[PDB]
Structures are given as structure tokens and as C-alpha cells.
Design a protein around this motif. Structure first.
Motif, PDB file in Angstrom:
ATOM      1  N   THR B 477       0.835  -1.197   0.000  1.00  0.00           N
ATOM      2  CA  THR B 477       0.000   0.000   0.000  1.00  0.00           C
ATOM      3  C   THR B 477       0.875   1.253   0.000  1.00  0.00           C
ATOM      4  OG1 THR B 477      -0.181  -0.226   2.390  1.00  0.00           O
ATOM      5  CG2 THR B 477      -2.016  -1.019   1.047  1.00  0.00           C
ATOM      6  N   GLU B 478       2.143   1.097   0.378  1.00  0.00           N
ATOM      7  CA  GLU B 478       3.115   2.188   0.290  1.00  0.00           C
ATOM      8  C   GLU B 478       3.524   2.334  -1.171  1.00  0.00           C
ATOM      9  OE1 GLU B 478       6.217   1.938   3.502  1.00  0.00           O
ATOM     10  OE2 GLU B 478       5.100   0.146   4.133  1.00  0.00           O
ATOM     11  N   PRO B 479       3.332   3.522  -1.748  1.00  0.00           N
ATOM     12  CA  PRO B 479       3.614   3.644  -3.183  1.00  0.00           C
ATOM     13  C   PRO B 479       5.113   3.678  -3.526  1.00  0.00           C
ATOM     14  CG  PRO B 479       2.945   5.766  -2.283  1.00  0.00           C
ATOM     15  CD  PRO B 479       2.779   4.758  -1.164  1.00  0.00           C
ATOM     16  N   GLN B 480       5.401   3.379  -4.785  1.00  0.00           N
ATOM     17  CA  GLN B 480       6.732   3.474  -5.359  1.00  0.00           C
ATOM     18  C   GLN B 480       7.054   4.948  -5.618  1.00  0.00           C
ATOM     19  OE1 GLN B 480       8.712   0.777  -6.094  1.00  0.00           O
ATOM     20  NE2 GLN B 480      10.312   1.702  -7.367  1.00  0.00           N
ATOM     21  N   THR B 481       8.312   5.341  -5.429  1.00  0.00           N
ATOM     22  CA  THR B 481       8.772   6.721  -5.710  1.00  0.00           C
ATOM     23  C   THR B 481       7.942   7.514  -6.731  1.00  0.00           C
ATOM     24  OG1 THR B 481      10.501   7.900  -6.990  1.00  0.00           O
ATOM     25  CG2 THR B 481      10.497   5.538  -7.048  1.00  0.00           C
TER      26      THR B 481
END
Lengths: 481, 481, 481
Positions: B477-481
Motif C-alpha cells: 500500500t506504500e507507493p513506489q517513488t
């Protein structure tokens, strides 16, 4: 001796329970032509012969017992009766019995202890519910002969260990030694139950031979109950009007229920499933064949949808393995998380450690540090304290130096744009990356050594934006540095 | 008032259901000497006394009701009857009742509302299946007195909420106030059922006192059914002829079935298992004791074989945890994969960026790039969009330079042979590693700065074979850069 | 033709089983005002009319069959009887039948094959247990008319495929064509069962019309059994005296048991749970709604406590995914472990490779190497050989050089103290990190190139304490270098 009487009683109850089990199956499984087949129990066939069609008609416990050997069933030494209640192939060539029962109700061989014990089954009465041939049986009476109260206690103990109970217990007597001679003992014309025995022991004619009649209700505890008070040996589910679905049964530990495939399965892959019935696949935890690390036969569980694709479980996972060091100790670990981050010092005043030889690190407070909350570890067994863990691996690193405007242009704060500013590069001496922790925080800091060939100047940088790391976090029984 | 009548009816039905539950247990659990013991229900003992041995003999619903107080059972105010159907230790010192039932069939204290309600149970008839003492009971009749049709509807409503139903409902009458005075109301000699009541209300002699007889079949819904139409309070499995195996029962939510240990378990570790029966261990999901991160009591599930070794589950896993940043938001992640790879530019023309100051990166097309298909993320709850993620950490890196033949010898394409070609090394300036994505591809590229001291030349290399990385891929759920 | 007779027999048995199923439900589910409601089966209501109240009284199989059309039930062509045993809304406008059964016991339309087959059901006898209106039914007899033994075999085959059996089979006859004309065929006054038919076929008067009476015991196999010999269509659990808890039933494969929510669930999240009953939450594996990677409806399993927090499973996990290379092959991986370690050469004699151009690596024996035991991989399906894997990513690295005392001060052996000794740094050329394996050991080694600007000397270091790595270990179908 109680111990002796208990062993006799256990064997007596085993015989009794087995005969009652047989009576309680109107449809039975036999082997014919090498395969299992359901047939009507010969007890309940109009065309059967002796002893299967034998019935007594004393439905009232206090009524006269049969005197007719075609009504009661003679039991024990001198009779052939056991062969009709045991498998035909109790011997290899086959007995005169006509049925190969798929299971033994009672042992082929009568329990050794009962060959000359003081108490033996002498006769069995199948009490008929009506007067038809092959009538249903509403009570099974066992007449036990005494070869001359202590036994009643051990019989009751054995019965409770076997999920059966006595409807009642009567004292019986005969003048001689014939199975047809038995009759209810009476006190003033009133048949004597064991409960009344203590009071009336005095008037008991010592010339008689005595015995006990134990009555069993074959329907008591026969069916599973809405209130859950009857245990199941197993429970199998139906498919299309056949008992073809999976079965649940307990193993011997008392802790485990075990799922096995149904007779209808074309494959052997038992599964427990969940279904929302809201338009998408049910999800199943299914046992499938596999191989272990030595290529030996094994199995595993697979969480899958109806297309056989793996499905998702949300959970904390612990994995156990031998320590890969000389330790043979076992260790536990959780699934890691990965975080990309750069340190965040950007301008010269923050970046440059001006007297690096004297400088002492204050990692809890240094500008540009990476700081994170320490994670909570999940539940662990026993026995095994989990520690929060964190590591950092280098993801990008350049020996940036001041540009014309005295600025540092290299910036790795965003992984997708790391090449966007090239920087003015010197020679790298490397980097020391340190990880520390309080009870609640992780502190990640770094120094970098850089030589600037343009000005012939040696630099030490603190927590620079042109150093980035991949941070791994997890919990483990293996401690942090 | 319906609400008032419903409350009376609920209490009446509770009393009725409890008495019927008691009748329906031939074997009951009592407490003796501080422990649970199975005994024959006193209803069904030949030696019991009043009121347990009381029976009426009106098997036909239309036959004459008993007038004999030793046959019917008087109920309510002025009688002592309740003590025989409630626990002996309803009071601390013990009542005159002889049985400490392990559970309450009905409350010690009669429901308060029934002390002076318009409708009360006046009498109970245990209809015997035969004429023996302690006979089985085939019907239980409850005579409800009216203290002068609306009630029938609320009674039926209460009954359906309690998994019971009425075999029938008759109107009864008496000339005065005695329990022995009740008789079936008749219309032209035909006993009046409630269904016939609307039609015949006109001829009903208003001088009488009226009541309702509610008949319950204690065997209806008593047993679990092949067709699944009767609910189970619980179901427990047997081991070695004893109800010693695990039990399943629902919790109050309607969603959960709960597995608990059987009485035969030496340990408390309930398990659900799978067995192929093909020569290897069954696999069990077992609940075991553990401790949480604060060393407080807790538990967990363990997937194990019969030797207690962890076993394997094939599945997609999601793990949830608090964000380790200032966020108190929860985040989800999957199990990562790791891939070792070197970039693949080998010769000078591909490797050297000749005008690095002007060069703009074309990461989707650059020679030597690492390219991978973007992974599909697994199912997630709600609520929580998963993103494909990728990071790269440095695994080997050297400042290779041209050799005599103008070739680059350092090569990290195979981890097992990274030291095999030493190379001609200059000074490292470092490396910038960038990760980009389209909808379907990951692109990993890198530049490296190197100073060649032999020729005093500064180089920038693109995607060099002498730079290798460990690539981590996962969903979050943590997005990519 | 057997095939033809089998099809007729299958249809006959389907009709028979359905009628018996109806008889065996004293309480039935109907639709009234659009919702399911439990009512008493009209068979067992005193106020019902024809054909529900029809009973015969021949409890003895050998007694005279009824001749009274208000006792037996006429069946088939010319009768209206089918409408009372099929749904009212078998047609849209509703039949004269009064009950909308929630399920079909038998099809609205009689099976086509039975419209003119050689064997048809001509009449049905509901044998009453007593002489009351709406009496319980203890036997159901079906009289099958022959339109002039082969059929008995196919009937028995069809019966065994449907979990029913015949109590017995009698030959019947009539002089003409009326349903009231049927009577038991006799041999010397003895009613003729099918078993006796082969012997007596010779004396059978060819002037008669013959048929078979098939008798079914509606209570046989009606209830689940303590010994597990009766299959369940489903089993649902109770909450607060209502059948409101979860249900288990088999799907069509024979492998799967499926859990679905109970009628009492306010949410649709069926769960299987474990409870130790030792003071902490039960743990549940619960199915919840989710979305797939395309935002389409899906579901997943969640292991949780009663607060809805994820709980812990100890297990080996395998994860399957498409290869992210051009491969569309699937690959398996396990959960990795992470280890922080520095190489361990500390003094110049161990550290410095004095003739690096000629030096050949002996990784199994080199001083300062990192060595680990190779892990055992878990069980895998089929089909899919797992390999132990290991990677190493750089965690700290500096170009240390000899100090005044000829010592190397930089030391990364402890992650929490990496910055503690700054070292005397030269220029980094980089590092080559190699991983090798035997059958039982992992070997991790490294060379580092360093230029010392103070002495203008080029160094190659072996396995230095001022190089540290994060080591990742896992198992995979993807092989190691």
C-alpha cells in the motif's frame, strides 16, 4: 480382587457393546466379490434363519422371560452361535457363517478371560417390537451366569467407558443348569431389580443358581442429538444423494479433527473452504502432494480459488529454521518490509563535518538522519522472544562536491529520478552506515568520505542526500547488533 | 397489549422448552462428589417416586385427560413440583430435590412475570408410551389457565424463536378451580382444537373457566437429520468409544464455528487436520500458547506435521502493520522476491557516455538496462490498493577501466564468479541507480563515475557489467517513488 | 434392454425418494407472503383433507392391503394427486394445491419416461402407526403396475444410488384394472415376496395382472448416526435456540467441505476458529471481501482475533508468481531471512593480497570469509524443485589504509557502532563480492581495491572487516548463479 473383576467386566462389556452395535445397524456393510456392499442386516430379513430371526416378546421388563430356544439365543460354550455374529473369513477357508462383515462387531475368538471366568454370558434375548418375522428389536437382554454386587460396580464402570448404559439390571435364577431354566427372581411376586437387592438378600433361597440380566436399549445414543450429547465416530457429507463427500473424524490425541476425501473424489485433495456466495470463487485450504528437500514423498496445504490459483491470506507469519551459523538452535523470523530512503542533508553547513577527527556522533539528534518508529513484533510461541530488526543496504552513492555556486546538486531522495542531477563528482572513500535504537525509535545515520580533486580537499559528509539506502525491517529471535 | 402478551408468552415458552429438554434426556449429567457424572434421568427409573414417575395414558389427543393427581403433575403456586426439575443447589444449603443437574433446564426461580400473569401453566401431563413404571414419554401436554386467541399467536411466535412447535392446541375447561377438573371442551361431542375455535366461539358456555392445552412432541427435532433441517448446539467426536474428541460449536455472531479440545486431550492444542492417507504425516493447523510483544498471554496457530515440525502452505500472504513513519495509518505488504542481476554493457562504445553533461537518459531504451515485467499484486481487503514495488541494492561495484586491448574485463554477471576477473581499477566516484516503470515494465538503469589515474581521464559509464544489484520486488500500500 | 429399464428405474426411484422425503418431514419450509416459514406438514394436521390424511392400517407386511380409496392414494394418469405433493406455483397462476414448498420433493411435471413405461406407480399406501387422523407414517408402500425380476435388479441399483433401500418387495395381483383391486399374491395362503418368486413362478396364474409392491421405511437413514453411517446433506449450528449459526456442506467434487454464514449473521464473513479457553481471544480464519489487481470483486482469508487484529501463523510459506523475465513459467519462493555481517580480516598480513595479479581465490578456506550452513528448503508441490539461495548487498564500505602503527582501525563488525572508528581513508576502487556453495556450506568472500594517496600505493584487500553486507537467504525454483 477388583482388578480381576474389572478385566472380566471390560471383556463382557466389549461383547455386549458389539452385539448391540450389530443390532443397531439395519443396513450393514459386507464384502461380496471382493468389494463393499450394503445389505439388509440378516436380523431383519423375513427369509433369514436361526439365530437371526430369534425373538423374545417380553417387552415389559417384569414379564415372563422366554423358555423357548427358538426365541432366546443360547450363547457361549457348546453353542455355535458366535459364528453368525462374526466374519465368515475369521478363518481362511471360511466358516459356515454367510456374511463377511466389513468390520468386526466382536472378535473372531471369544476373549480368553471369558473362557472360565466366574461371570459369563449364558444367553441373549432380542426383544421384538412386534410379532412379525425379522421384527425390529427394542431391547437386548444379556443373561450372565454366576459360577459360585461387586461385579455390578465394575460392569457399570466398564459400561461408562464404552458409551453404553443399562436400562436395568435384574436378578435371575434357575433350579438347574439349562439356558431355558432362567426366570426372574421375585420377592413376594415382585421381580427383583439390582437396586432392590441389598434389602432382600436375606430371603434369597441359597439352593438356586443365580445370575444377572443386563438390559440394553439399542436405540439409546444411536443418533446424533440436537443438544450435542452424543459423540460422533465420524461424520461424512452427501453429494447428489450419495454419501460421497468428505469425512471428519478425531485422531487419538483428543485435540485433532481430521478431514479426509470422500468416496466421490476423483482426486485425493481434501479441502476446507469458505464461500461468501456473492458472485466470486469460494476459497479452499487444500492438501496436495509434494516432495521434501530429499525428494521424499510429502504433502502441503494450498490456499486456492476454484481455478486452482493461489489465493490470499492476511496474517502475521512466523517462519522457523535452524540457525545457519554453527548453532543448531532454531530461530524465528517474520516477513520483512522494505523502504527506500535517502538521508536529507542538502547544504554545506549541514553536510560538512568540519573537524571530523574530533566530531562525536549524536545519532538521536543529528540533522538529516533517517528516523523510524520501532515496530511491534507479533505473537510468538513459548518460549521465543522476538526482537525488532532493521538493516540498511546501499542503493545509490556518489562523491558529490560543491559546484560553482557552492551547492550540492546530487539528490537521491526519489528513486525514479536518481540520475536527473549528475553532480560534480570527486573520489569516493566510502561510507559508514550506523543503525541505533531506543525503546521506541530507529536511528539511521551515515558518514561519507570524499576527496575533491579540483581543490585537493578531503571531506567528511554527514547524512547526505546523495546517499540512499534500502531499509529492511522485520522481527526475529536473532538479536539486533 | 401485544408487547405484554409477548413477554408472558416468551416466559411460558422458556418454561415449556426446558421441561421438554429434560424429558428428552434419558441420560443426564449431574454433579456428585464435585464431579460430572452420567446417570439415568429419574423420569425413567423404576424406583423413582413422585413426580418423576407420574404418567398419563391419553396417547390419543382426543381421549379423556387424566383426573388423577398421581398421573398428571400439578404445577405453579401451592405446589412443590418445581424443586424436582431444578438444581438441588438452587440454594446454598440444598433443596429437598435430589439432583444437582449440571445445567439449568429451567430457572431456579420461576420467571417473575408468571407470578400473576393472565396465563399460567397449571398442570403438566407426561403421556406414557406404555403402562410400565418409568415409561418413555411420547408427548408432553401443558395446561395453561386463563385468569379472565391473541395469546396463541404470541405463543406460536415465541415457539418459533425457540426451535419448538406445537403438535396441537386444544381448548379445555373446568367447572371450578381444581387441577383435576380440566377436560377437553367439546362441540357436539367433538373435542375442540384451536383451529376450530373461531367457528364455534358462539356455543361456548360462558359459565366455564377455560384454558389451552399445548402439546409438545419431545422427539421432534431431537436428533440431527440426514437432510440438515435440525441445528446442532454442538458436535463432539469420539475416541475409543468415548466422547473424548474435539468439539465444534457456533459463537454468538452467526459467522464463526469454534473448535475446542476434547476431554481426552492431555494437552490443550485443538487442531484441524488434513490427511491424504498415502503414507506420510497428516498436516494440522493447531492453536498453541504464546506471548505477545509485551510478554502478555496470547496464542497463535501453527501448521505442523505429527512430529511437530512446521509444514508448508502455498498462498499469497498479506501482512498488516502500522506505518513506521509518523503515520498511524496501517499498511499492507506481500512477501518479497530477490533477484541477482548485473547491468549488461560490455564494450567501450556502449559503456562510455561521451558527453555526460549533455546526455539525457532514455531509460526505456538504453542498452544494458535491466528490464522486468511488472508483477500482478494479489487480492487485498476493502479498501486497500496494492502497488507493485521494486528496489535495487548494490551487490558488487568496481571502477573498471580499459585494458591494453581497450577492453573492460570486470564482469559481475554471475555471482559465483565475481572475483574471477580482477580488472584494471581506477577511482570510484560512485553510482546513481534509477528505477522507473510503465504500466507493464520495470526499467533499472545506472550511471557510474570513474577516474582513470593512468590516463588522467574522467569517465561516466552507462549500465556497466561491472555493477551488479540485488533487486527486491513486492507489493505494498506504500507507493513506489 | 437393461439401459432402457435402468432409465425407467432411475425415474421411479426419484419419485419414490421424493415422496418419502416429504413424509419424513413433519415440519416443512413453505413460502407465504414471499418469505420462508416453517409449518406442520399437512400430512400431520388433524384438519387436513384428502389426500394428506389418507392412511392404510396394514402395519404387518403380510396383512390385507386396503381396498378403500380414502385410505390408499391413487396415483398417475387420471388422478389429480400430484398437485398436492408439488409446489402451488408449479404454474405461474398457481394450482389448486395450497402449499408453496420451498424446494421440489418431486418435479412439477412427472418424468416423461413414466408416461407410458412398462412399469409405473399405480398407488401409494401411507401406513399409519396408529388410528388417529394425521397419524405418523411408519411405512410407505408403492404399488407398481406391469404393463405386459429384471426390473428388481435395476430398481435396487437405482435405490442404492439414492441412499434408500427397500424394506421388502412383494408380488401383487388384481383381476382387472382398478387401484382398489390389488392384493398380495399368495402361495398356499402365504404372501409372495420377491425372494420367494423364483421358486414359485410355475404356479402363477397367467390370467392375473401383476405388479410389485415396494416398501420404504421413511425413518431408515433419516437421522445422523453415532457410528457415522448416515451422510449429511448439510449441518448447521444453533445460536440461542435458533438454527442461526454457520453451515457446512460438501461441494460436488467430493474433496471439499464448504463453510457459509448462518441466518443470524449481521455480516457475511464466515469463519473457522480455535479457542483454548484460557483467558485470551479465540483465533479465526475468516473470509472477507476484497478487490483484485484490476479492482474486480474478490475475497480473501484473514487470520484474526476477536478485536479484528491480524493474528499469527507459524508455518513455512511458499509464494507462486509468474517469472518477471520473458518467462511465463511460474516460480516458487519462500520468506527470506536477513543477516548482517562483516568480513573478518583485521591485520595487514591477512588483509593485503601481496601479488593480486597472480593470486587465485580459495574461497572454501580463505581467512576472514563469511561461512554459513546451507539451509534446508521446505516441501514443495509436484513438480517444483526448490533451491537454497543467498545474496549479499553492501551495508558499509570504506577505503581504510594503515595508520601510524600500521593498523586498520575501520571496523563494521557491529552495525550499531560502524561510525565509531573513522579510519584513515584512501580512494575506493570498489569491491567484488562472490558467493559460492558446496552441498552443505555457503562461502561469501570479497576483494576490495584501495588507493593510498599518502604513500601512492595501490592495494587489494581480502575479506576486510571494513566491508559489511546484508545477507539475504531464501529458497526458490529460480536457481542460484
Amino acid at each position: 480382587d477388583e482388578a480381576r473383576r474389572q478385566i472380566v467386566s471390560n471383556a463382557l462389556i466389549s461383547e455386549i457393546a458389539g452385539i448391540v452395535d450389530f443390532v443397531a445397524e439395519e443396513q450393514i456393510t459386507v464384502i461380496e466379490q471382493g468389494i463393499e456392499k450394503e445389505i439388509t442386516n440378516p436380523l431383519y430379513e423375513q427369509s433369514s434363519g436361526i439365530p437371526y430371526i430369534n425373538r423374545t416378546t417380553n417387552k415389559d421388563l417384569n414379564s415372563t422371560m422366554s423358555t423357548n430356544a427358538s426365541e432366546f439365543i443360547n450363547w457361549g460354550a457348546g453353542t455355535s452361535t458366535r459364528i453368525f455374529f462374526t466374519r465368515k473369513y475369521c478363518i481362511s477357508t471360511g466358516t459356515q457363517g454367510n456374511y463377511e462383515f466389513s468390520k468386526d462387531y466382536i472378535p473372531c475368538e471369544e476373549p480368553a478371560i471369558l473362557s472360565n471366568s466366574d461371570l459369563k454370558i449364558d444367553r441373549i434375548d432380542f426383544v421384538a417390537t412386534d410379532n412379525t418375522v425379522g421384527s425390529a428389536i427394542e431391547r437386548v437382554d444379556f443373561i450372565l451366569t454366576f459360577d459360585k454386587s461387586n461385579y455390578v460396580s465394575s460392569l457399570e464402570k466398564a459400561a461408562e467407558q464404552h458409551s453404553i448404559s443399562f436400562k436395568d439390571i435384574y436378578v435371575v435364577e434357575r433350579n438347574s443348569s439349562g439356558a431355558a431354566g432362567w426366570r426372574l427372581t421375585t420377592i413376594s411376586g415382585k421381580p427383583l431389580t439390582f437396586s432392590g437387592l441389598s434389602k432382600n438378600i436375606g430371603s434369597l433361597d441359597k439352593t438356586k443358581n443365580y445370575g444377572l440380566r443386563l438390559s440394553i436399549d439399542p436405540n439409546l445414543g444411536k443418533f446424533l442429538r440436537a443438544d450435542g450429547r452424543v459423540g460422533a465416530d465420524k461424520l461424512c457429507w452427501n453429494i447428489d444423494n450419495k454419501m460421497s463427500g468428505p469425512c471428519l473424524a478425531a485422531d487419538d490425541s483428543g485435540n485433532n479433527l481430521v478431514l479426509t476425501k470422500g468416496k466421490g473424489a476423483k482426486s485425493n485433495e481434501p479441502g476446507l473452504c469458505w464461500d461468501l456466495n456473492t458472485g466470486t470463487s469460494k476459497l479452499c485450504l487444500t492438501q496436495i502432494e509434494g516432495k521434501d528437500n530429499n525428494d521424499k514423498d510429502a504433502s502441503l496445504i494450498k490456499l486456492k480459488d476454484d481455478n486452482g490459483n493461489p489465493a490470499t491470506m492476511l496474517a502475521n507469519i512466523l517462519v522457523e529454521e535452524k540457525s545457519m551459523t554453527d548453532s543448531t538452535k532454531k530461530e524465528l523470523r517474520t516477513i520483512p518490509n522494505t523502504i527506500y530512503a535517502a538521508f536529507s542533508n542538502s547544504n554545506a553547513s549541514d553536510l560538512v563535518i568540519t573537524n571530523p577527527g574530533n566530531y562525536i556522533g549524536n545519532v538521536t539528534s543529528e540533522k538529516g538522519r533517517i528516523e523510524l518508529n520501532v515496530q511491534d513484533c507479533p505473537v510468538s510461541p513459548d518460549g521465543n522472544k522476538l526482537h525488532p530488526r532493521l538493516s540498511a543496504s546501499i542503493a545509490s552513492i556518489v562523491a558529490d562536491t560543491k559546484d560553482s555556486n557552492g551547492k550540492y546538486q546530487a539528490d537521491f531522495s526519489s528513486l525514479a529520478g536518481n540520475r536527473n542531477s549528475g553532480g560534480q563528482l570527486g573520489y569516493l572513500s566510502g561510507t559508514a552506515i550506523q543503525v541505533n535504537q531506543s525503546g521506541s525509535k530507529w536511528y539511521i545515520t551515515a558518514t561519507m568520505g570524499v576527496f575533491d580533486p579540483l581543490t585537493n580537499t578531503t571531506y567528511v559528509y554527514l547524512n547526505p542526500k546523495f546517499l540512499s539506502v534500502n531499509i529492511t525491517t522485520w522481527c526475529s529471535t536473532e538479536p539486533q547488533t
